[PDB]
Amino acid sequence: MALRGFCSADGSDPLWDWNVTWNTSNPDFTKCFQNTVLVWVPCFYLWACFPFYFLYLSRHDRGYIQMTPLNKTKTALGFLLWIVCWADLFYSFWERSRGIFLAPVFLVSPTLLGITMLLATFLIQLERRKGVQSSGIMLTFWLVALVCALAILRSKIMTALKEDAQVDLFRDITFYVYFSLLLIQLVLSCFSDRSPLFSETIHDPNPCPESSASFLSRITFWWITGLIVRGYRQPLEGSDLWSLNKEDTSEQVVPVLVKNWKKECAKTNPSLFKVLYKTFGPYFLMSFFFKAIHDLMMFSGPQILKLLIKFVNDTKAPDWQGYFYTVLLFVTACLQTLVLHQYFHICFVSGMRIKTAVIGAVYRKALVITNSARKSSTVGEIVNLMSVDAQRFMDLATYINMIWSAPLQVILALYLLWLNLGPSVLAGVAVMVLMVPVNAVMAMKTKTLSAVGTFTWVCTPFLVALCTFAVYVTIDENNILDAQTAFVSLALFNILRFPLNILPMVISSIVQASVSLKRLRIFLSHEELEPDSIERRPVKDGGGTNSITVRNATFTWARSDPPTLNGITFSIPEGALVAVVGQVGCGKSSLLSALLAEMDKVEGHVAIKGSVAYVPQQAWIQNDSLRENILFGCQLEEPYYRSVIQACALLPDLEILPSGDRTEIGEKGVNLSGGQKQRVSLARAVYSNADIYLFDDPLSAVDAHVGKHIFENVIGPKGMLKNKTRILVTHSMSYLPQVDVIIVMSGGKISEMGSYQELLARDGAFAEFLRTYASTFISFLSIFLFMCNHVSALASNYWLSLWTDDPIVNGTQEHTKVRLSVYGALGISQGIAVFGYSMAVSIGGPEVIKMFMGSLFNVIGACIVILLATPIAAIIIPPLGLIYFFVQRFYVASSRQLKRLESVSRSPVYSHFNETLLGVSVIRAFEEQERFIHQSDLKVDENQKAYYPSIVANRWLAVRLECVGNCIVLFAALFAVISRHSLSAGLVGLSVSYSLQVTTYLNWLVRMSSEME
Amino acid sequence: MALRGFCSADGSDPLWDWNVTWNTSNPDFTKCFQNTVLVWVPCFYLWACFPFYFLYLSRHDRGYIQMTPLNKTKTALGFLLWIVCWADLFYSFWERSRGIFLAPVFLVSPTLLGITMLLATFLIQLERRKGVQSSGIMLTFWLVALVCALAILRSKIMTALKEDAQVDLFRDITFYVYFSLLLIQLVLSCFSDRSPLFSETIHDPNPCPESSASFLSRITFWWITGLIVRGYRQPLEGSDLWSLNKEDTSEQVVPVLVKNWKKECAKTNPSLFKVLYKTFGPYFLMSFFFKAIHDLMMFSGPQILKLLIKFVNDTKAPDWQGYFYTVLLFVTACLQTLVLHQYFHICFVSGMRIKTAVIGAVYRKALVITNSARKSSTVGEIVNLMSVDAQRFMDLATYINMIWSAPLQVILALYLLWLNLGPSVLAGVAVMVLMVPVNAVMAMKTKTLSAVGTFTWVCTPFLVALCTFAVYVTIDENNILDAQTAFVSLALFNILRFPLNILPMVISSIVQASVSLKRLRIFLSHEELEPDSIERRPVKDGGGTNSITVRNATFTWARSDPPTLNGITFSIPEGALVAVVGQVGCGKSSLLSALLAEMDKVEGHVAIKGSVAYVPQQAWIQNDSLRENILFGCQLEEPYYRSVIQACALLPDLEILPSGDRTEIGEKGVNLSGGQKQRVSLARAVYSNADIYLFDDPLSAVDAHVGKHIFENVIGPKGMLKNKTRILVTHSMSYLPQVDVIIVMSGGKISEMGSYQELLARDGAFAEFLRTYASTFISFLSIFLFMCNHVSALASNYWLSLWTDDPIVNGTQEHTKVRLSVYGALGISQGIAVFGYSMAVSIGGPEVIKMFMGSLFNVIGACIVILLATPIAAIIIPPLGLIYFFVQRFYVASSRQLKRLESVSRSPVYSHFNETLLGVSVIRAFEEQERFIHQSDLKVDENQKAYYPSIVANRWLAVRLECVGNCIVLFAALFAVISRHSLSAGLVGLSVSYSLQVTTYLNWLVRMSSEME
């Protein structure tokens, strides 16, 4: 209560009077209020946002924009804005000192403005130093200060020329100068800044323009209009799209997630969503504050409307009041559409940023890890995990914020409806519960009346309103239907309807996401890094005499099975032909694979020296050129290519092919034979030019006569690779005598080792093997029904408006029985007509034309109602009938060509992953597993360059189609307040109510039932 | 008088009447006036501009802009606008047919609007067909129609909502739709068109943007701001300039003038003047119609000011009148500055287009015509005709339109002043004749206190005003100095002053131009075509046996002299060495030159064969590379270059040079000896590789040994040119015996011809010749004086304002004879102060700082006066104190770098013309005179590319610095009309008078006293 004594020494200027600002014909604020609150509010606004902005900006150094003249003039203006406010205080000090008592108010309030201006000037310099072009804080502060100064300027201009007023000629000049400088700075603080000294774009010439735009352009999504119009004439395809900004690329996201997951695993299990909470968490806290505010802006629509009606029925209030509400019907309807469409963008971006990391984390955990423990099917169990489970992590991101906002709106709307009407709404909302069976009906239709059901859905607002009003009127008495009662609930029900629709289908989505999480987690922890290290590396030393060393080796396929190899110990020098002999199923494959770090060793010491080349019995070919398949990464070399082709004898195979060594080999191409595949693999192996070669019956399917030249050309001692180490396994008989050393193993143990001559002289197991084997009319009806239904609805609304304005005498209002009778009769007629045209269209037939005609006729009716209420609105119909039109044609011809590129670019990632998963066994032997990781990175990135601008073109139109909807309410309220002396309450209520339901029906027509056709 | 019965049957709605539009508190037009005149005016405006536009556009086909959607929508909008106006007439016909008498007025107007709408729609398509992007007629028509319809809309909105009247609901909707469509079309018809299918710019990538700009941009000169801003930071030089538009080039103007002049000469200073008038007449006639509107709008300021001053003194007129005049103070002050600056551009372009044609005509006449009759000096008589006479043909273009507008303004202003004041102004204007002496004074100050002279010039308006008012108030006593009398004449004198000063220096310029015309015509009429046809061409036939044929030849140097050659007849075969022998002054040079078609023949037959090479005794070198000088256009050839260098023996000369054959030879370079020059010319001649060679003592200054070596190297029979025809003349005593045929001539007649042996055996005159030639402290004082003078002027103005508002009692102005005394005393004090600071600045010394300080103090006073008159104007001072500033700094730093390129580019054309005039003889001997015309063309075009945008940057600032001046009058009248209840007439008069004189003093500061220092 100190303000009363603070304002003056007599208490004659109370803060609020209610007799000077509201009840007069010329409102004007008092003195103390103007001096204190209007001055203080900007300072409090800015002083509570400086530490947060400073802390946020202390981590985002980006540039050094040096000496633009804008920074030279803005600093000067900010410094000049301080000296006048200081001079005011200096003059006040003089006046106090000499002879005048002036109260402490003049000695305190001015001194804060100087401090705030000094802080703003310093912030401009810091903002320039940290290098950001457009500012989102200076604009708002300048706007607020300008409005607060405009109020005082109007008050002073009104009180100046009243009657011979005595005003000191030292506070007018100061305030006028201050206001002019504020206006100049507001204009000047929105142009641009030149550029940072250095930027990321040094080589790529096509960057996205989002990094360089003004605050208003980013708010209104204007920078996307560049490539939309260009898509209308010139077809859109190829490199016309932009490039990423080096932040969403897969090379800068996956390592962070994999490191955090590895650290969490080493800490110990909680699911990976626990890690995602601490990785991608601080970007969802901005998507929670934006939603709630929007919700509180939804219920400022009806209330104002109610007030307006109460103003029309009063015939003695001052006129200007009717202009105070209308302005508030424009700001509130404007700030609501500039907040939701930013929360949507944040949610979509943070939901897209997760899939590009999960995909990479899955891929990097398959090619080099989880060996010998993979038992799930190769198709539909691993590849499906890349296309279905990871694709259900964007819906959850958008829908996770609808779990608590769904019941809040319902509770608030029910409370307001109960406050307005009374207990009857409990029955009325019961009808709302009674049409929960209607959503049950559409659900069971989806399981399996569709048109009949949707027309009952269309008609159900009428049914619920009629039932509510009948219950309100029939029960009890002495209740009169005013304009507010019958014209507020109609909007409240429409607002409340949507959350009762959104509640289903969400609880199923959450369950499905939770189910998918279990599978993702069980796969990401499906191993314990089996091939960590058991060998002496494929190549560790560049020089040695003994190639393969092994002592006391023992390996097993699985940890729960008896060992298959025991007591394995041998040594082999360099450049010796070693051939092993074993029976079918003896275990040759297991021993052969144990050398490639594909087994589990319990005890033993084994080592190899030099890079290895592997030729498995099964061959795989990547879908590419035969030249590329043979080269396998290495560049061409002549006549090395000719030499290796001659050695492999590929001349007939190259000649028979339609284009030689350039056709489509493998899948999605011509089919070959097994022998040709084996020859191609052998050619690739010999081209690899390794130190040790490891074969596995590479000539079984090749004809023996044909394979004779191959054996005598390369494998035999006459070949060009006689200086390397060769290992060959087979069950052939002919090639045994020409090898150097023969090793025979059975029962998991090696029996004898030695040369062919020594084994033959011994006449032991080899002799026994040789001896045993011994192989050495409806259109016009539909139109008429449409017209009947629409005129029935219009007559219903007109009759309700006429009824709501009946005079009140002796409690009741004349007659309240015939109105209900005619209302019910017309409702029954409309219900008959809707089913009649339902049957007509069902017999004639579809839904696209249905909704198209419905929306067109409804918007025509919405226009004609406003035309009938006031004959001056016809000025604004033409100009608003064109701006919308040009929006509905650019979007259809530009969002239909960007929805086809994704279907083209989707397949390659899945195909590449399937190929890698099928060829991992051979890909790991060559020690070439980084190139493939890089390769599968450049295809996912190509599916996120043509997909990012396919959703912004959805946040464009939606914004552009809501300003049109909100520019009719203002002009239907302003043109109705001017002529309050001749308009009843009902007509104003109808005109205002029909202007709210235009944006929904305008947006429905453009998206659905237009692009489909 | 038919309108009275046309409006209505009983004539109850007459035409204009002051009882309903002017004397009321709510002005509103009547019914018949609204129905007829406002509607009819647009139709008459457009219907009187269609044939002219059609005729002008039927000759300027430029493109085929095909199917822009703007042309698709504008036609539809026009066709829609037609139908509503037709429907109005249809409904009127129905109403007249059924039961209603409605008068013929409703049956005429719609059928007259429909025709205009259809014509506009057709004109859009016709405009599209001929390919013009921006239209200057559609915008004006739409604006006029909208302005006319605004009043009808206001009346129909005012008469409907209030008074509870009855309005038919069939004419409101039609008019509202019509107004909305008009607004939409006005907005839509000012964007752009796409492009013509083909344009001139196919190769050059830097065209001037003037060919592609909107109407508003062309009017406001907003396409030169692109490079003015760019030149501030990056230095301006080189290729940053644009290119011509293929219309001002010298290859497309000179032929037209030369053809017209030749035709006029063949028909037979009236001749040249008539030819110029017939050639460039059409584009100058547009300059007469633009210096008529501005002259009339000049006199619309004093009338409005007088009306406003009279209105302020009235305290019962309705308030809104004060807002009708102020708007008229903005349109009139705006249309005046958008007309003069469009006449200046046309005048300057027409002035520039003449010099580029006169220069080309003179050059094409000089080189190949007027031979043997040139007697004027080579310097200062012909070259001066290219730089002085043709440079005085741009001032005449601008000043020729000031010969009749100078006295018209004087006469009109004198008549108005006499009407306002009376006979006293005749005495006062006599005192205004009294500065005819003082301008004569500065005239003699130009011939030989000058600061004192200009300070008396500054004080002159005060002196003449004081004398006029003293004379007005002294004689008799019948008139009282009101506000209008003392505040209209002050502006009228200032308006009238300038033409009284422009009149001198023009009559001298006209005389000088008339003098220059005589010399230009006497040189251009100097044709006297010498080389018409006298020879058989230098080369006509490619095959023959006799080289030179001559019979009965006779030639003379001049037509008024006895012939020097008579009885010349001889013949020589192909490849014969012919040497002629003559005495000194015998006439060898005359006969030698006669063979080159440099003489005139009265009788005889002479003929030559094959292209000729000429080596005159005097050699000329163009300032270029020695390689280019020797090549003379031909490309280099090896080892031809080495062969000719060895033949000419140029090895020591090339070796001794600092860079060999690459130095700067000739003028502006190193000097060379005469022998080297002769050797260079001989090398050029032999490089020419002609059929007939003609020498003239080419070894006079050459050393005897060097000359002998050259003679045996090339000229002698052992040389490489023995197969062609050689002619040599000399007086040497050694080379005669080795020649084939010797010809001796004397007295103009050839005596004997024959071989050396025959002549020696004859022992005639040859033996005689042989034997004959064988025998042989103030700064602060200046500041104080400045302040005293300015406060004295301010006190003078304030005292006059106080005096003019004295009450009138008994016919007299209270008591006079006391204001005049103090007025004169303060005037004398101001004169003493200005003389004192004159002496101070003369002793201390300059003019730049003088005018700078004067303008700064005057412009600060012009703002302090407005601030004192009304304390609310302080809002507008800051924002207008910045827009001007940024204009003053860009222009100074961008028009100082474009005023230096001309000084660089001026010299080459004069230097090239001098070189050509000195080399004419050799340049014509070689039959190479077409390349040099192009060479001299390519430079005058380079002097007109950096000069065209050096004057538009003067029409930019002047436009940008007059809207600031005209935006203070509006805000000083509006802020003074609001508070008429507390302001006397004197303060309003002072404020409005001082607000006019701000543009002149703002423009004076930027151009002078700023750029100079």
Written overview of the protein:
- Two copies of one chain form a homodimer.
- Chain A is mainly alpha-helical.
- In chain A, a hairpin with a 2-residue loop joins strand 12 (741-746) and strand 13 (749-755).
- Chain A starts with a helix and ends in a 6-residue tail after the last helix.
- The interface between A and B is medium-sized, with 25 and 26 residues.
- Chains A, B: Glycans are attached at residues 19, 23, 810.
- Chains A, B: This is Multidrug resistance-associated protein 1.
- Chains A, B: It is a multi-pass membrane protein.
Core attributes:
homodimer; 1013 residues; mainly alpha; Rossmann fold; three-stranded antiparallel beta sheet; 41 helices; elongated
Radius of gyration of chain A: 41 Å
Oligomeric form = homodimer
Biggest interface between protein chains, with counts per chain?
Answer: A-B, 25 and 26 residues
Would you tell me which CATH topology of one domain in chain A applies?
A: Rossmann fold
What class, by secondary structure content of chain A? Answer: mainly alpha
Strand order of the largest sheet of chain A: 7-10-11-4-12-13
Name of the CATH architecture of one domain in chain A: 3-Layer(aba) Sandwich
User: What is the terminal-to-terminal distance of chain A?
Assistant: 69 Å
EC number (chains A, B): 7.6.2.2, 7.6.2.3
Subcellular location (chains A, B): Cell membrane; Basolateral cell membrane
Protein name (chains A, B): Multidrug resistance-associated protein 1
Subunit structure (chains A, B): (Microbial infection) Interacts with human cytomegalovirus protein UL138; this interaction mediates MRP1 degradation via the lysosome.
